Amino acid sequence: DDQLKQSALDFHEFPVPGKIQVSPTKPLATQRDLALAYSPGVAAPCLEIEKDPLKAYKYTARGNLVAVISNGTAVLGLGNIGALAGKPVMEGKGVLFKKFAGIDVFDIEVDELDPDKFIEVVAALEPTFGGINLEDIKAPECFYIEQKLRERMNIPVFHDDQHGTAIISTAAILNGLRVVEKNISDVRMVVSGAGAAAIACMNLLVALGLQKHNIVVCDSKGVIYQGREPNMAETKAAYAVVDDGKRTLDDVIEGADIFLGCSGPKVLTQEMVKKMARAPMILALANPEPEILPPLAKEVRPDAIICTGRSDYPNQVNNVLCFPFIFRGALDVGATAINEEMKLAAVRAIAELAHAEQSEVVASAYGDQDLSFGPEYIIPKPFDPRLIVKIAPAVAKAAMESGVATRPIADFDVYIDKLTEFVYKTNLFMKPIFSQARKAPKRVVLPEGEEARVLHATQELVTLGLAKPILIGRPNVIEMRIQKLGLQIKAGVDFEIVNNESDPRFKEYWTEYFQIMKRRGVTQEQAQRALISNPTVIGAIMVQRGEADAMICGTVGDYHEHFSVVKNVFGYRDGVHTAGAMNALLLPSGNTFIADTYVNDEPDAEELAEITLMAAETVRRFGIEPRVALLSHSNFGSSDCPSSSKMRQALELVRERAPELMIDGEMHGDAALVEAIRNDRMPDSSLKGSANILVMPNMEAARISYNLLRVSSSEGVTVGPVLMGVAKPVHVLTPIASVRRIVNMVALAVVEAQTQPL
Amino acid sequence: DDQLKQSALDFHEFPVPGKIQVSPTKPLATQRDLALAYSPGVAAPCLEIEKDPLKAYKYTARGNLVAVISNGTAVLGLGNIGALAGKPVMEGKGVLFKKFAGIDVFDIEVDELDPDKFIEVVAALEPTFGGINLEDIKAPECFYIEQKLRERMNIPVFHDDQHGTAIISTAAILNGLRVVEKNISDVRMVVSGAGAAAIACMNLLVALGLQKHNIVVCDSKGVIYQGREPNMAETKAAYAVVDDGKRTLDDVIEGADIFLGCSGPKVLTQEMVKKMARAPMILALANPEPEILPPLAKEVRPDAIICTGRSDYPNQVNNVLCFPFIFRGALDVGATAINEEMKLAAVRAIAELAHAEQSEVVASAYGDQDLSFGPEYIIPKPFDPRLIVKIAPAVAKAAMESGVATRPIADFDVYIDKLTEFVYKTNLFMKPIFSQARKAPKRVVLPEGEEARVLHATQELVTLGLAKPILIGRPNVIEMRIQKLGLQIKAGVDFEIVNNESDPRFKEYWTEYFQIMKRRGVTQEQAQRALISNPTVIGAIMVQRGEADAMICGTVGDYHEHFSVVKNVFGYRDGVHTAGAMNALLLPSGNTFIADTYVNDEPDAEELAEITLMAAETVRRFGIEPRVALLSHSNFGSSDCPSSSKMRQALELVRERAPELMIDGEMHGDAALVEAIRNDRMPDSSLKGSANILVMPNMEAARISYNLLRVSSSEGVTVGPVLMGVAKPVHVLTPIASVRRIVNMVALAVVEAQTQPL
Amino acid sequence: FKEYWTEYFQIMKRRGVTQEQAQRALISNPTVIGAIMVQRGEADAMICGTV
Ligand SMILES: CC(=O)SCCNC(=O)CCNC(=O)[C@H](O)C(C)(C)COP(=O)(O)OP(=O)(O)OC[C@H]1O[C@@H](n2cnc3c(N)ncnc32)[C@H](O)[C@@H]1OP(=O)(O)O
Ligand SMILES: CC(=O)SCCNC(=O)CCNC(=O)[C@H](O)C(C)(C)COP(=O)(O)OP(=O)(O)OC[C@H]1O[C@@H](n2cnc3c(N)ncnc32)[C@H](O)[C@@H]1OP(=O)(O)O
Ligand SMILES: NC(=O)c1ccc[n+]([C@@H]2O[C@H](COP(=O)([O-])OP(=O)(O)OC[C@H]3O[C@@H](n4cnc5c(N)ncnc54)[C@H](OP(=O)(O)O)[C@@H]3O)[C@@H](O)[C@H]2O)c1
Ligand SMILES: NC(=O)c1ccc[n+]([C@@H]2O[C@H](COP(=O)([O-])OP(=O)(O)OC[C@H]3O[C@@H](n4cnc5c(N)ncnc54)[C@H](OP(=O)(O)O)[C@@H]3O)[C@@H](O)[C@H]2O)c1
Ligand SMILES: [Mg+2]
Ligand SMILES: [Mg+2]
């Protein structure tokens, strides 16, 4: 716990406190715009809203924000710690809101511990938000707040902690009945636990068609029957059962077709599973520890379908399936609330998507797709790119038929086109790489073993279990620096040290290097010096001999001093005559790759075509459809310099060698990234949307552009420089490489080594 | 009004509604970070705040936001129109907050029309904000709200609409007494008007040292004396005077040393000024129309000092002097409120800055500096870059001595260094250009007169009075397109049309062109064709003949087809042998210029040195200190390609020819923009901070980098491409030029033509 | 070691040698060590090149 505690504490404490910030979306540097954006001109918009209140959407940005409001009464599993102490959780919830759907979130921690004032303040804050996600609140005051607001608010009010997880649970049950081959009106549902995210689920399931008399509710006290306490509170009498001696979970665990558990860990015992019914449908939503372990249920009864809230098992009940996309559906039409119709229109799109998987470009073999509608796959993945095109139009149509939509949409196809254009610019492709690497770690040698960044990265890799590292350097220096940095990695146990000043394999290593380079200017004495003073050579020989599977080098020195060694020892991949390096950037238009940043100073047309094909294949392996643009200062033949002609010839060669690849050129960068400019210049261009692969005419342009964009349009680091064309898994980094970049590159190298490391 | 109404309505209605947006400041695309940013890891930060509540500043971003809260009871001069209808004004106020100081603003329009619930909701919203700027609220409920909050809030509460303008008024009076040579305890102050931004000013002036019995208050009723109404409300009895027959403004206008007017236009008459005292000190803060016209006061009495709230006169009382910087001072220390000490510590820094002007790099002769402490200059300019270094440390020191500061600062010099680093990246240099151009418009010919963008720009230029335009094209097409676009410009009155198909000056024009180009491959017949089919040639001959002062061309066609004409007709400036083009970008590090984007395909070392010197001089004329970086894929001699050696030679030449210029190289782009990387590589580099001029080795790198940065790191448009080295004021644009870019370039050309157009 | 590699870096900082590269050179390149020794006056001459 201490290591994880320190990692989380330092996750955002040192560089900048917090996890979100407020940023403007429009520019302001001039005069005569203040005369219009302020008092002299701002009077005209105001008088329009006064005459037409409905015109507040054209001249303002009112309806796009959501409030995440808490009081800190039940902070995760920590309980009542206060509203202020719960700010990090609310901030992280807003982060998840923004990262998965693109929802602006204001996180508020009201200090009120009384309900009445809670509704007072939330109703006062009405004009600020288009929807209020109540979070970290006890019961049953939340229901009262939501009902009073919805009957007093002309704007959407949606407690997500109830209704969103209700939707996710309901969709996992409607599709589960298909697999178990049972009817909704004949199944028996048993629930052990009452709380905030249980009553909404029960209401949704009852409105789905399930009989109320077939539902049994419980808590820590036992079966919630009639005649248990003199003062038995509400939200428990509408679902209570008559007293027939039933008092515990096991009394109703027999014959239960569905078991929706949302309270308490370690509740279901092996005997209860043994005495359960056939084809169990267990929904153990408990996050810190589920009600029943999915490995434990599938052992005693292999016919059980388990839909947990954890990230370690499939069919994950994560609210990131609910609060991003359900709120996005509610907002995009401008509702007045999510009634049962919208709650069902959203629950049916999720279920339809879960049983209509059709591949459509995935991360090659990187990871584990296994997308087949069955027991192990009942709901869409937490960050499915398609869950904005299926939910938002569905909710908009439901609102149009329900009378709560204020501004109807006429042409839906344009709407889906706009939403898919929006979702094309988000792709978290490093998670499957990390998962695949964790599935089977490989041996990776790091020649710069004395570097502080490399030691930090080695600690992280050992903690995550991504690879088995081998460090080259002086043992005394490495141990002293590990102690100075306060790391927990130990030589020999966590990682292996190769002493470059002394090793029993010195003779074999330098003899092999001499045999490689004897007719390339290297004498035996020079080989002996190289196997002592050049760790890259040691690592390359190690890889070639099969004592390691991959190598990450280049954090010290110049790129070509490592690349020359790599090329000499490994050589090119079969059928390849050139190599290139690709760097990745996250721009507003999406993930963007820049090709040949480090290898070739001035490639010719054939080299450019080979680089383009390799880059397209590599990007395809990430799960991204390649869209290539050949860049030049000439815009579609406007210049006749030899560089532009070379780009045109490379385009012809690429078209000859790969007719299925999306590519155009030669063109300017803005035309490559902005579709409107390109459509103005070349209406019938084969390149659609924004290009994600930019191939440059020469080294200097590529490197200068990449450096300026990296320091200017900085939105995180994924991979780079990615080396292509070499016959072994190896990448050369740069001295400015960060710890996260090193870890990512090691994971990518492990994944490459797993599949025939050639 | 209709034209301004349409301009303001379309200012932000068509492209995107609204004027602000919410943007994150940290990246999120990976896994294993959700395990730390959320539930599994987010528990560790929460338990730390529970044990230590003061630790909420290290693990959260709590204290940086301000609420701008209104109820729409007095919207500017429109009165009571509602809270929702006042959203554009609040949004614009937040825009001004962010643009001048960098303050995050949440704009709220509460529908409550009752005070008690207003304090209820604002006190409920305490944990969201570090300060509440009450706006658009009547009196005296605001005082009650502020007092109750400050006595119930442990966080800063600062009604800016009272106290900030009180500070600005007080600073304009303390410095005014120096000019008028009078004592604060012996002056007579007369006020005609009671309102929100008058009682705070009176309180501040009384605490400054002025006697209460020397202050006279008035309203529409008249003198606020005792015994006027049976129920005379508060905030008027603490300053009322005894009844001696004084009932109107003129009864107390005699002998008044200071006249602070903040209510009503057209209040002071000529006779009142005639019967006033010597050295009048008039503060007419009325925004829509001042109490007395500054031109009217200075005529009857030339000894009067007037400090108005308008932008048409000096000594402007604009809250952009108050709410950005005073709130910044309050926030940067983490106060508990702005008491009199902070209110005075901020008012003394403003006064000290107003009478301690020392130039320190201004916009050359572009505009009107005239910074001399006198009657016409009593307060710092509304967007003075230095008003964050003088106010924030002053307020922090005042808080440290007052016991309201929670986290004291030890080393102040580091603090001022950080603040000046922050303020170095903001410079609104186009406003002085626009002002200087408006002072003396010039004749500017636009060869592409039939373009829709050019017609829109011509309409804007005529409206702003920046230049006298001359359009070249077919009159029928121009009139038909003007009618189709619905513009109000009329040929012959607003602008002059030159018909390229018929003009009585055809023979002289083509004869002059032939005389220029007879030994450069142009026959007489070719000259006759050129003076019909090439509008750029017509415009260039017009400029050379003195029938126009400048030309803006290039919105259609290729850059070099216009540049060749310009070079042939005009030639180089005396003492210059090469030309270059500079493009401007607004990056996170500040205004950034990229040199030689369009002229020279591959300049040599001497050409690069000349380009660098011209770019440095041009940037200096904008009011920006030039800091040049020579860019290459080689980092301080790491490569030996001819391009890197050329950059090194150019560096040596530049150092020889300009020893006073800040410059270094050759280096990578990231080292040029990020000081930490450069300090790591070259500790003793002469380049300090972030470079704002990037000189590129060849055309392709410059253009590709500029295009990618413009479409990716887009933060508005200022100028570009700026042509340097030509012997006449002319600029060649590109086909992708926007209307705003054309207007800006025309203004720059006018300013260049005003000063010896060579 | 520190004085030697610092002097070498001061000589070669604008010739493609970083501080880390200078530190590596003052360990793996005896010719550089001898040349710095001679330039510092701790030796009068150097004979190198047998390898
Ligand atoms: C994975 C890697 O390889 S990382 C790189 C590791 N780097 C190193 O190990 C470098 C350190 N080692 C070295 O530099 C060399 O092994 C040396 C110079 C010390 C010795 O190698 P060489 O002198 O060229 O020859 P050789 O391989 O025969 O070894 C000589 C050794 O045998 C000993 N020896 C002496 N006479 C004899 C003999 N007749 N027969 C065998 N050994 C003998 C020597 O004393 C010497 O001992 P030592 O090296 O343990 O001190
Ligand atoms: C600012 C600018 O200049 S924008 C560019 C404007 N462009 C133009 O004006 C192009 C339109 N004009 C033209 O192309 C030419 O003036 C032309 C071709 C029409 C005529 O010019 P030319 O034939 O070369 O010769 P010249 O200058 O002597 O003019 C001939 C005219 O004189 C007339 N003329 C005939 N005999 C004689 C004579 N003995 N003496 C004088 N004029 C005569 C012709 O009928 C003709 O009349 P018109 O041009 O009004 O119809
Ligand atoms: N979608 C999700 O991921 C999700 C959503 C909600 C909850 N959860 C998880 O579910 C658990 C409880 O959440 P909650 O909203 O129900 O909070 P809660 O109501 O505060 O706590 C669970 C409640 O269930 C009862 N309970 C406790 N232990 C029990 C046990 N062993 N057997 C039966 N009943 C027991 C108690 O009710 P009484 O005190 O009234 O007897 C207790 O108050 C937590 O682990 C939480 O993380 C997950
Ligand atoms: N810093 C600034 O730029 C700034 C700040 C504040 C105000 N102003 C300007 O000052 C004016 C008034 O603002 P305010 O806050 O005072 O609003 P206000 O109180 O709502 O309106 C002005 C008040 O002054 C009185 N008044 C009106 N006309 C008058 C006249 N001709 N002579 C004397 N008194 C008159 C009336 O008070 P009774 O109805 O009680 O008699 C009236 O209610 C507006 O033009 C406003 O824009 C500028
Ligand atoms: Mg929660
Ligand atoms: Mg105001």
Residue numbers in the entry:
A (entry chain A), B (entry chain A): 2 to 759
C (entry chain A): 507 to 557
The authors write:
While reducing NAD(P)+ to NAD(P)H, MEs catalyze the oxidative decarboxylation of the TCA cycle intermediate L-malate to produce the TCA carbon source pyruvate and a byproduct carbon dioxide (CO2) in the presence of divalent metal ions such as a magnesium (Mg2+) ion. The hybrid-type MEs consist of an N-terminal catalytic domain (ME domain) and a C-terminal activity regulating domain. The PTA domain does not possess an enzymatic activity of PTA but acts as an allosteric modulator of catalysis; that is, binding of some metabolites to the PTA domain increases or decreases the enzymatic activity. Binding of acetyl-CoA to the PTA domain is known to reduce the catalytic activity of several hybrid-type MEs.
To find the acetyl-CoA binding site of EcMaeB, we collected cryo-EM data of EcMaeBholo in the presence of acetyl-CoA (EcMaeBacetyl-CoA) and determined its structure at 2.03 Å resolution. This structure reveals that EcMaeBacetyl-CoA forms the V state as does EcMaeBholo. Acetyl-CoA molecules were located outside the apex of a triangle formed by the PTA domains. As a result, acetyl-CoA binds to the positively charged surface outside the PTA domain in EcMaeB. At the acetyl-CoA binding site of EcMaeB, the thioacetyl group of acetyl-CoA is inserted into the space created by the α4 and α5 helices and the loop region (V499–R506). Acetyl-CoA binds to EcMaeB mainly through interactions with three amino acids: R475, R482, and Y510. R475 forms a hydrogen bond with one of the carbonyl O atoms of the pantothenic acid moiety in acetyl-CoA. R482 forms a hydrogen bond with one of the phosphate groups of acetyl-CoA. The methyl group of the acetyl tail in acetyl-CoA shows a CH-π interaction with Y510. The α4 helix shifts to approach acetyl-CoA by 1.5 Å and the α5 helix moves away from acetyl-CoA by 1.4 Å.
